[PDB]
Design a protein around this ligand. Structure first.
Ligand SMILES: Cc1ccccc1-c1ccc(-c2ccc3c(c2)c(C)c(CC(C)(C)C(=O)O)n3Cc2ccc(Cl)cc2)cc1F
Ligand SMILES: Cc1ccccc1-c1ccc(-c2ccc3c(c2)c(C)c(CC(C)(C)C(=O)O)n3Cc2ccc(Cl)cc2)cc1F
Ligand SMILES: Cc1ccccc1-c1ccc(-c2ccc3c(c2)c(C)c(CC(C)(C)C(=O)O)n3Cc2ccc(Cl)cc2)cc1F
Ligand SMILES: CCCCCCCCO[C@@H]1O[C@H](CO)[C@@H](O)[C@H](O)[C@H]1O
Ligand SMILES: CCCCCCCCO[C@@H]1O[C@H](CO)[C@@H](O)[C@H](O)[C@H]1O
Ligand SMILES: CCCCCCCCO[C@@H]1O[C@H](CO)[C@@H](O)[C@H](O)[C@H]1O
Ligand SMILES: N[C@@H](CCC(=O)N[C@@H](CS)C(=O)NCC(=O)O)C(=O)O
Ligand SMILES: N[C@@H](CCC(=O)N[C@@H](CS)C(=O)NCC(=O)O)C(=O)O
Ligand SMILES: N[C@@H](CCC(=O)N[C@@H](CS)C(=O)NCC(=O)O)C(=O)O
Ligand SMILES: CCCCCCO[C@@H]1O[C@H](CO)[C@@H](O)[C@H](O)[C@H]1O
Ligand SMILES: CCCCCCO[C@@H]1O[C@H](CO)[C@@H](O)[C@H](O)[C@H]1O
Ligand SMILES: CCCCCCO[C@@H]1O[C@H](CO)[C@@H](O)[C@H](O)[C@H]1O
Lengths: 146, 146, 146
């Protein structure tokens, strides 16, 4: 974990974000149970009957939050890991990881909590900024070593 | 690959799971062809006409299995890789990877095979357990190096 | 970045592909705005009224392209990284990464541009070939170190 000074901070933030995705998965399951809205007939038949194989807006919302996480957090897992080894300024790297962590936690709160627009959109944008920054830095480092 | 004693086992299990996801992708395509259920008008027009741009429950099921894989296997690729470098007991690490591999293969069989509830849900839970375990271990290691 | 001769090429191609996924995300948002097709009532109410919380075929197409990217590019991020450290022939490794990069960029163009079948399907197949190749190579290396 001490292979680079920024690595511990990266691993802390990334792992917290993975756990945060698992929290969304757990919430999704609980909403399915509460609202009796199952994706599969085999699930529905165990939990009240075939009529409960149905869509639900809250389930769909949970799935959107989880999908958006997959569209954003998974790239961060890659970019942040590589970036940790490019010798960035420790504080600067910290700030990249923290902005992503805070932005993404806020995104899930804004999504699942149905907060007014443009709160969710702003949190998404905030979090994407350090990702764009790391991506460009990796490009320069990779290109110059070709 | 010998950068850590647990790494070969991790790389074997992870790569098998990636191949298992590709198998789901291949099955999905075959179901689309068999059931004539295409997502795109350009596909449908090559394969019988515009009426074949349509949803199908078996195609949707394949997509759910693939999506669930993305929600679970992708985090494992990250967590398991990092965990391999934290000096875990070789046998203990093996067990983490094997439980995930077996649980996830069983999950796909239970999903695509339409096995009775709660078989699929149990396989998902089984496989998530070693992921939660690795995530916590990474948190402790990262935090203590800050 | 010089931990292995193939690594710079891998990091260049992978990071470009992550940026290419972000481009799809940006396009998706712009299509939502242009076509007034929002996934969430809170978005719709800021942008003209509740009737604009609705699906749209172009938005759905963008989401399919992005999802297909998640089904294919994310595995490449893992496989290509590991493969970079297995001492492959530099030119051979380059070719694996370039075929994936070109195939995937072409895939997005074919998907979003609604090009005739089987153009998109062929680009997908082309790009999967080096992934299958790397996966098998990782399997052999991992297995022989057990
Ligand atoms: C900077 C970056 C780097 C890497 C990847 C993506 C991006 C990136 C690119 C673009 C955007 C990006 C693009 C449109 C954006 C925004 C951000 C924001 C914050 C708004 C809301 C505003 C502030 C106008 C408001 O409502 O007042 N719009 C309009 C909008 C609103 C709803 C929907 Cl569904 C789609 C589009 C956000 C990003 F994170
Ligand atoms: C432990 C862990 C670590 C990390 C991430 C997630 C989790 C995790 C957390 C919670 C669960 C978790 C939550 C509800 C669960 C289960 C597991 C299981 C196995 C059941 C079925 C039972 C056994 C009751 C039955 O039917 O008899 N329920 C109820 C249920 C059933 C169907 C649907 Cl769609 C949603 C919820 C599964 C997990 F893997
Ligand atoms: C080789 C590999 C390695 C790893 C993972 C997957 C794969 C992999 C496996 C299979 C395929 C794979 C499977 C069916 C394929 C193709 C490739 C191609 C190119 C076609 C179009 C043809 C050429 C027949 C035409 O239309 O003339 N079909 C038929 C088809 C068409 C549309 C839909 Cl929705 C589903 C299936 C593509 C792959 F990339
Ligand atoms: C990481 C997981 C974050 C979970 C954030 C959940 C925010 C829940 O927020 C709640 O949402 C309800 C309906 O959506 C509203 O009725 C409540 O007013 C609101 O408190
Ligand atoms: C990694 C890929 C695993 C593929 C597992 C596929 C299991 C197929 O299982 C089959 O499913 C059919 C319909 O779903 C049933 O009619 C059959 O009884 C059953 O054998
Ligand atoms: C990485 C992002 C790639 C973007 C490729 C977008 C290709 C757009 O292609 C355009 O699509 C329109 C409708 O789909 C058609 O009407 C136009 O003829 C076509 O030029
Ligand atoms: N897949 C996204 C691509 C763009 C994006 O990520 N937008 C942000 C800010 S508006 C978001 O939170 N999207 C909601 C979602 O993905 O469900 C979408 O459909 O909107
Ligand atoms: N996205 C999941 C989150 C929870 C989850 O992964 N549940 C397991 C056990 S019930 C599952 O197999 N879900 C089916 C699916 O994701 O389609 C869901 O909608 O259910
Ligand atoms: N999830 C894919 C699995 C197979 C696949 O990736 N097919 C390629 C070639 S036909 C594709 O471009 N699929 C379109 C898509 O995923 O939306 C599907 O539903 O088709
Ligand atoms: C998409 C808008 C976000 C801009 C990200 C800024 O990212 C910055 O880019 C500079 C030039 O590449 C780099 O020198 C710098 O290290 C990086 O932080
Ligand atoms: C979510 C329920 C799964 C529990 C995972 C247990 O995980 C365990 O956690 C302990 C305390 O952090 C660790 O000491 C131990 O290494 C780890 O295997
Ligand atoms: C799914 C069809 C794609 C085939 C990928 C070919 O992949 C090849 O496999 C050989 C045998 O494992 C390896 O010796 C070779 O390094 C690899 O490039």
């Amino acid at each position: 974990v001490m292979s680079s000074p920024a690595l511990p901070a990266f691993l802390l933030c990334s792992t917290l974000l993975v756990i945060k995705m698992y929290v969304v998965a757990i919430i999704t399951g609980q909403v399915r149970l509460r609202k009796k809205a199952f994706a599969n007939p085999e699930d529905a038949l165990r939990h009240g009957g075939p009529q409960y194989c149905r869509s639900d807006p809250d389930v769909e919302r949970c799935l959107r939050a989880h999908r958006n996480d997959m569209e954003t957090i998974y790239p961060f897992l890659f970019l942040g890991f590589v970036y940790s080894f490019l010798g960035p300024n420790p504080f600067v790297a910290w700030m990249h990881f923290l902005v992503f962590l805070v932005g993404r936690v806020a995104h899930t709160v804004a999504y699942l909590g149905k907060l007014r627009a443009p709160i969710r959109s702003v949190t998404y944008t905030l979090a994407q900024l350090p990702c764009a920054s790391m991506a460009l830095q990796i490009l320069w480092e990779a290109a110059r070593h070709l």
